Amino acid sequence: HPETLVKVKDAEDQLGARVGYIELDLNSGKILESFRPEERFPMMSTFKVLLCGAVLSRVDAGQEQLGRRIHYSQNDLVEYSPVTEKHLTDGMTVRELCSAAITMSDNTAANLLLTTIGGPKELTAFLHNMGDHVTRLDRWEPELNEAIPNDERDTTTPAAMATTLRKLLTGELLTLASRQQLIDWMEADKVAGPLLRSALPAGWFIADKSGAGERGSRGIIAALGPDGKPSRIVVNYTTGSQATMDERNRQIAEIGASLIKHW
């Protein structure tokens, strides 16, 4: 809806920073709205959904098992690792690692999982081979959040991210079981409360993943819809603002409010 476009433009003026936006119909794959769809933005923790997509594709092929247990050292622990810092003794299964990466943005979990697939370059090769030749992961946590202006490392575009998420969730690439697991992790997101979720009417489905980084970078990808079933994918990024995390949060929530209001 145009009113949603106005809210994105609202946000871009008020944050003094580029904002990118895509609305995608889940069923048909048609674009409903867009704003800067071909511009690059830091992915931040929104990459972790793509990461566990690659992991699940390996699980499908039997190159990985969700129940396999990984042990790690205190040295592997980087900034913000709420879950993995609690399992130095017993380790964590691959499933538990994706759960922490996605629901809680656990950075050490993401790095451990990056290791299982061969690193940033192999995630990028994964995306390339499922038809996303735009998104790229280059560094590990926490450095991939640096968000240097016009750096294309660790970036995607709204359009690239939206279509890639569509294919992961509702495409033929992953098994139905793996599709379901990926969306289940996203539905259990615990660190995106003040964003899209804050606009949600009671009884709506939402599966999302948010990100934050340096230089005012903020973002969210989501599959959402009324009546407990997702029907639309939304992708929203911003970078470059000097604004607080809180204002950035409220700006995304306003865009979400327009999205729902004009559904």
C-alpha angles and dihedrals in degrees: 000000000000091000088061089050088053089054091053089049088046089055094046092055096042096046091039088224142103115274123193124199141180133178113193129185108231097208102045101022091229121147112245098179137359141180123179089347095166098046123104124245132176109263096210110174093344084085091071091077090057089045094056088044088061090045091052092049087057090048088053091052091046093245087117137029124210090218096053111119124228124199122199142175134248085251091066089060113106132177116313106012102152097167107027092053087065096057108053090122103045102024126216137268121241089251091052089049093054090045091055094041093052106031096039107017092240105187098200089049089055091050093048089051091046087056092054092057097041102266139280093320091056093050087052090049089049091054091044091055093051089054103267105123094164109057116080136183114200110159141036133244127322098010096059088074095064091109096195107188112266091002105140094198114113092008139131136177125241090245095047093047094046095052093042091051089048091054093046094049103035107011131097096250098090125043117260089252091053093046088052093048092050093051090044091057090048092048087055091056108146101180104058099069101127095045128065091338090064090065095047118118116224112280098027123132119233132175113177150151126206133198139199131185147153125308095034096301116162133160152160139193120195149171109208142155146152125278099029095298128099116233105160137044120218127193123186131172138167133182139171101045124133088207125120124263087248096058090043087053092051092047092056090045091054090053088049090051091056091045092056095038091056097036 
